[PDB]
Amino acid sequence: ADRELDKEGVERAFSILEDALHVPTNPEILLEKYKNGHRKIPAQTVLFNSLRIWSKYIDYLEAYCPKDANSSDKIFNKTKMAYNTVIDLRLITPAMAENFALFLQNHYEVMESFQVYEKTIPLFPPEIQYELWIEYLEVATSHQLSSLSPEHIRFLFEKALKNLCSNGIDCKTIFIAYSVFEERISGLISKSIEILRRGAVIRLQLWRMCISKAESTLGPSVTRELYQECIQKAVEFVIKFSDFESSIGAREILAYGAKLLPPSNTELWDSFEIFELKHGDKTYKDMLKMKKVLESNMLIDSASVS
Amino acid sequence: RGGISYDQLAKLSYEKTLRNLATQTQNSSKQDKVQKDTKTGKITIADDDKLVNKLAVSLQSESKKRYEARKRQMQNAKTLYGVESFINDKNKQFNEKLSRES
Amino acid sequence: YLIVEESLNNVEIVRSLYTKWCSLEPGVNAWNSFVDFEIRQKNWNGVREIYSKYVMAHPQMQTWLKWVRFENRHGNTEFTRSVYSLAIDTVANLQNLQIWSDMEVAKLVNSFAHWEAAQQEYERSSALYQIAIEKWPSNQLLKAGLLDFEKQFGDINSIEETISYKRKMEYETILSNNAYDYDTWWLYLDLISESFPKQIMQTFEKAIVDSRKELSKNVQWKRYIYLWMRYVELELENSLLEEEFQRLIDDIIPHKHFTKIWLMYAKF
């Protein structure tokens, strides 16, 4: 192929490489009879299976198609059937599945590139679907030609988000993409229960903390519910987050310092928390010294237990 | 996990011997009726004596192979463990049997 | 008995043995080794006779879908849709016996449709979803498996038509479960105002303002108000404003007939 591409046209380079890729009647039987055949059956018959053959065939097509193809052209109809044949042969790698969906979005075939993500995710195992769902959900919300309804974009998240956390992946971004887009198209703070689910799946502390900042902008009635639910090494970090929420909107915070120190070992960071709560006031270094006195006595009790 | 039932184990032993019979025909190919006596009632089947021989040899070969694969397991497991107190071989095989329980 | 007569290359004795053994209805291990026997012998017409009997001995989709995995392995298109036509009629013919579950019939409808999508006939892929949902309105899995077919092979207005229904059922089942989640109301109404404009569109707005006391609640009524107002309006406005208003009635009398309805709603 490579010597003929320089000497002769790419149409000559296709035609010598078209003869490689005849998918005859049945690839399932020929693939199996080749694998079970002990070196007697030639690989001339099962030559279509080879990924290397398809990728450099396609890369000639995707290079030869013009920058404006718009589906009238023969070649854009030719590279799409050659791309779809790879998916039907099922020998498509996930970087190659992105190269076809990217291929359609440059040539304004955006609404058919959502079919491209749709066909392939089923075929792949998770830990790889997470990289396709980023590129699929981002085209749905960011690309300008995609006019999808806000109940259709919400379908694409909560079909993925439910499916993808079911097999078990951290899913930090998809939660945020379903969190960020909710203001740009809908514009209400339903964001919290959409993002609470990140904190309570069945990193996670870094999803819980940024959003409990966000409802202190909107309204304190839905902050204080999170401050309760935030606390129910990692446990100690959750207690610290609760103390910060109390400072934003003090006795509940000090008692929380007790609840957290009693949550778990060391507790000096909690001392920094109560000290922060004391420092926040613009009252008497009496309750503070009493607090350090109570903490020290608790430490002495822990030493007695040990 | 868990064990395999006898109907499943009989199928897998069925499938394994077919692959031994497949490669036996492949290794052969690489190198190169019914009569019912009406008076007695008996049925007679004419078959190749080579295939009866290859049936008889393979069963003896599988019998010796399992006999040797167990014999080495007898010689290994006798010379593995000597920590817990024993008296004879039947004590050793019993207290090892207590170890598989827990 | 089999692997000895296999070893003797007596192919007519294992065939006579298997015909007897599959007559006593033993289980799926026997039949699957009997369809694997004829693949060895290349008897393609004989193994097709077995699956005719194998679906009658074990009526279940993993025996029917095994027979379509046989036919799609060989690529014979005339034989595969004949099996597909026999599989979906027998579910319809034997509906009252109740031996295939809702998740079980969804595997047959989807594997019929995704095969017809690969056979480039999308109008047969599309129409069978309608007959299956009507033929079975009970199973949600066949309705939900209808949607994923449109996502892959359908044109965009058809997906949005079907998407609007699944969102309708899922918003309906949360609000029946969860009592006062006011943020799902403000989308469920806007689900029906956007894509379900009809008698239902007015009706839910009644059914919402039924559910409407919080600060979190009452602004939903404000939405239903203008939703009514954009399109009576005074009559429902007085009924809701009755929550309590002596200053309001004195404010009402001075600027109801004098100035508008928008002035009337300003009091509320």
Q: Which amino acid is at C35?
A: V
Alpha-carbon distance B74 to B78, whole Å? Answer: 6
Q: Which residues contact residue A156 at a Cβ distance below 8 angstroms, ignoring those fewer than 6 apart?
A: A136, A137, A140, A148
Closest to A151 (Cα-Cα) out of B102, C148, C191: C191
Cα torsion A76, A77, A80, A85: sign: negative
For A60, phi then psi, to 5°, come to -75, -40
3-state secondary structure B51-69: HHHHHHHHHHHHHHHHHHH
**Cβ density class B57-71: b for 16+ within 10 Å, e for less:** eeeeeeeeeeeeeee
User: CA-to-CA distance for A273 and A267, rounded, in angstroms?
Assistant: 10
At a CB cut-off of 8 Å and minimum separation 6, what does B57 contact?
none
Contact between residue B48 and residue C9 where contact means Cβ atoms under 8 Å apart: yes
Given its phi and psi angles, is residue A146 left (phi above 0), alpha (psi -120 to 50 degrees) or beta?
beta
Nearest-CA distance B3 → chain C (Å): 17
Q: What Å distances lie between residue A170 and A136, A155, C71, C201, CA to CA?
A: 18, 20, 41, 39
User: Do residues C167 and C188 lie in contact, with contact meaning Cβ atoms separated by under 8 Å?
Assistant: no
Name the DSSP letter for residue C213: -
Alpha-carbon distances of C127 from C79, C116, C117, rounded to whole Å: 21, 11, 12
Quick check: A75 and A69 in contact, CB under 8 A? yes
Q: How far apart are CA C265 and CA C229, in angstroms?
A: 10
**Rounded-to-integer distance, Cα C65 and Cα A148, Å:** 35
CA-nearest residue of chain C to B6? C29
The end-to-end CA distance of chain B, in Å, is: 17
Question: Which residue of B lies nearest to C31 if distances are taken between CA atoms?
Answer: B11
Beta bridge partners of residue B34, listed in sequence order = B45
Measured between CA atoms, how close is C175 to chain A, in angstroms?
A: 15
Gap between the Cα atoms of A199 and A226, Å rounded: 10
Count of CB pairs separated by less than 8 Å, A with C:
45
Q: Which of B13, B14, B29 to mutate to test the interface with C (most CBs of C within 10 A)?
A: B14
Q: Residue A185: which of C223, C158, C181, C190 has the closest Cα?
A: C190
Tokens of C37: 């026997």
Shortest Cα–Cα distance, B12 to chain A (Å):
19
Resolution (A): 3.6
Using a CB-CB distance cutoff of 8 angstroms, which residues of chain B are in contact with residue A38?
Answer: 23, 26, 30
**Closest-CA residue to A45 (of A67, A73, A21):** A21
Q: Which long-range contacts (CB under 8 A, 24 or more apart) does B17-26 make?
A: B17/C3, B17/C6, B18/C3, B18/C6, B18/C40, B20/B58, B21/C3, B21/C6, B21/C7, B23/A38, B24/B54, B24/B58, B26/A38
Instruction: Supply the DSSP string of chain A, one letter for each residue.
Output: -HHHHHHS-HHHHHHHHHTT----S-HHHHHHHHHHS-S-S-TTTTGGG-HHHHHHHHHHHHHHS-S--TTTSHHHHHHHHHHHHHHHHT---HHHHHHHHHHHHHTT-HHHHHHHHHHHGGGSPTTTHHHHHHHHHHHHHH-SS----HHHHHHHHHHHHHHHHHH----HHHHHHHHHHHHHHT-SS-HHHHHHHHHT---HHHHHHHHHTHHHHH-TTTHHHHHHHHT--HHHHHHHHHHHHHHH--HHHHHHHHHHTTT----HHHHHHHHHHHHT----HHHHHHHHHHHHHHHHHHHHH-
Specify whether the CB–CB gap between A231 and A259 falls below 8 A: yes
d(CA C159, CA A163) in angstroms, rounded, equals 20
The label of the residue with tokens 């600060």 reads: C215
Name the helix (H) or strand (E) containing B30. helix B6-31
